Symmetry: C2
Subunit: 415 residues, 2 copies
């Protein structure tokens, strides 16, 4: 049994935000029918290809386990298929521009009439009433609008985007929470509803603690743990803090052996408040244990980069993995800056199902990020991504179309 056994998803999404949400739904046991433009398909199929003429990894890593149908919803036969899909569906997920579904002949009111149980999930760039309501939002557009770029990077550099998909996959995971909550709600009301999620709000949610810091700043005029305290300057907005800790425990990114030629020969190192004595023992600075200039976070803060520099004298002499194996014995919170190469090959992440090898037609093996959370009663089975239109016939057959009707729809380009 799987959590979403028997749930049927009508999936119009493309790219990353919507598809990450629906791939999870598939992994949870739902039947995800991905509706794609005939002869075109989700754009990720053809972007960033590593092997000529076959689906790109962009596609395969975000569409595992889905069924692909080609359907041209602008045609009258396509419209009729869609109505039948809506009628049988538990969830419809879309990440089009406002009014796309309405213009296909299916307003929310019309959808409720066809299927009052249906849960309608929509990803947009900004919320309904926003001044940016018609910006077309890509990943980094949302990162700018949601607070992350403003607060990421260095105080003496530009706003910086994160590699992490705060606008795209993070929005998908938030929509998924909403869809799962709406399935739970449906069990009580007997009804579906519309769940909307904006990319700007997804970013903002992960930046919650920077809105903590803005209020502190408004009230006090400084942030005691930020690099700018006490010798630099605070403006009216939360500033960029480089590689600072972000919470109650300060830290930094420190160079390890190889950093001149290896851009990932680094660790993150935390000076944990309750672990100062251990930290001194690790670096061989017993004099610092009780010196009042060093014994509290308060006293450390005004010369904290001298202390990081002193720790870096140790870390530069050894490989990041060996640095972490040593430092962790002293309870120091640290880890290596693992590169995507290390992650791709890490045998532990294969064993834990975090990185998963998957067999794909025409390609052979590829790696994906697996189902992030582990369940003691359920094991996902991560499968190939569908070739374009691979499941069109099967889906139409399930709606009661004959093989001849299906062939006629292929010939007149409804599919």
């Amino acid at each position: 049994s799987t959590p979403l056994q028997g749930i049927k998803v009508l999936d119009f999404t493309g790219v990353q935000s919507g598809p990450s949400c629906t791939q999870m739904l598939a992994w949870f046991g739902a039947d995800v029918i991905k509706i794609e433009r005939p002869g075109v398909g989700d754009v990720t199929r053809h972007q960033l290809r590593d092997i000529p003429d076959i689906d790109a990894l962009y596609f395969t890593m975000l569409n595992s386990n889905k069924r692909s149908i080609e359907l041209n919803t602008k045609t009258a036969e396509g419209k009729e298929v869609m109505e039948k899909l809506i009628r049988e569906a538990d969830i419809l997920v879309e990440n089009f521009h406002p009014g796309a579904i309405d213009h296909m002949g299916f307003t929310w009111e019309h959808i409720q009439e066809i299927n009052p149980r249906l849960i309608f999930g929509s990803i947009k760039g900004f919320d309904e009433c926003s001044p940016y309501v018609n910006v077309k939002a890509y990943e980094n557009v949302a990162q700018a609008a949601g607070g992350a770029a403003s607060t990421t990077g260095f105080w003496d550099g530009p706003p910086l985007v994160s590699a992490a998909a705060l606008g795209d996959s993070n929005t998908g995971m938030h929509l998924l929470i909403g869809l799962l909550a709406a399935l739970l709600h449906r069990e009580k009301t007997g009804r579906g509803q519309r769940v909307t999620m904006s990319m700007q709000d997804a970013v903002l949610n992960l930046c919650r603690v920077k809105l903590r810091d803005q209020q502190r700043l408004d009230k006090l005029g400084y942030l005691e743990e930020y690099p700018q305290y006490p010798n630099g300057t605070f403006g009216d907005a939360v500033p960029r803090g480089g590689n600072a800790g972000g919470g109650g425990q300060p830290g930094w990114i420190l160079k390890c052996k190889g950093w001149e030629t290896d851009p990932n020969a680094y660790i993150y190192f935390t000076i944990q408040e309750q672990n100062w004595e251990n930290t001194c023992k690790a670096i061989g600075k017993p004099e610092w244990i009780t010196d009042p200039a060093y014994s509290t976070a308060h006293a450390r803060q005004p010369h904290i980069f001298d202390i990081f520099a002193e720790i870096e004298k140790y870390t530069v002499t050894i490989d990041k993995h060996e640095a972490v194996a040593y430092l962790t014995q002293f309870d120091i919170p640290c880890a290596p800056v693992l590169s995507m190469k290390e992650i791709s090959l890490d045998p532990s992440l294969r064993q834990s199902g975090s990185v998963v090898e998957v067999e794909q037609p025409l390609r052979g093996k590829y790696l994906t990020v697996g189902c992030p959370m582990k369940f003691s009663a359920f094991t996902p089975d991560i499968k190939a991504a569908p070739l374009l239109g691979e499941h069109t016939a099967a889906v139409l057959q399930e709606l009661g179309y004959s093989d001849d009707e299906i062939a006629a729809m292929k010939q007149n380009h409804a599919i």
Copy 2:
């Protein structure tokens, strides 16, 4: 009606990752009973305080709607209360070090015997088989281990952490998906189960597209859309790309008027492949429309920073908001880099429920991030965070304890 009406959560979490998850559970209608150490409470109550002697915003922004009980589970009476709480609960969440709950006297086995319906959610730094299992993971430690620090920042700078809580809140949102799935699964199995979520895996999941890029790099030796192509150099790992788009459409962070003294006087600007003609018109360069050195993404790539410099000649002349209002009419994807000050005061984010003003005892008003997703059939009510032990008596009363028994437990220090 609420999505989680009638659900009871036994919540041991502190700091950010676990509390973010359970705050959302409360907002969805669950009764979240937060278990705190008598006389001390979640550390966030006293860290980064803006107002002396009352609960910090670190705490109130992450613990809205929860009930607080003070309970020493290491005592015999506290253990007996805990057993009664387990019997009544649907979900127990914890983000302690491995084995803490076992040590309390409740293995997962023993919990299953007491309450076969209970879903046990656990947040850890790393997965069970990891070499880093007993590393203490803070926010940025997980960012390092998860691939984000490696791939964020500039190619000629160090790895950079993100302001966005990739390790903390993001992990809480991923556990939340699991718990909601587990509730759904329970409707069929009649049984709870254990759901575990590591911070490393949460980071990795958002970095999924960087694993796409690693595989592309492994196969081809270069990433054609990365800043380093074609005139720079690729190594064996996906490199940092500064403010590059991260997907199929290139972009960058551009200066707007005021940038020399306003570290957030910037926009994100996407050069969308189908929108070159309009991009040229927006910046008054009609001659670039059909010039073969500019008309395609492939041709633009080797000189893309000149192109951005040229756009920047326009954007530096106007406020970032006016830049976006204009450029958007030319279909150019863009948004301001909004500061946390602008976010905190943005009337549209108030209207949309994205930033919410909450009345808190002793403090007055504070701002929080609201419930990220919107539901057409459900409106969350965000309320104050609990004062330490504010609900101890009521919780024990609901378990059948008399006032005398409760007062006796206070004097004993079991509560």
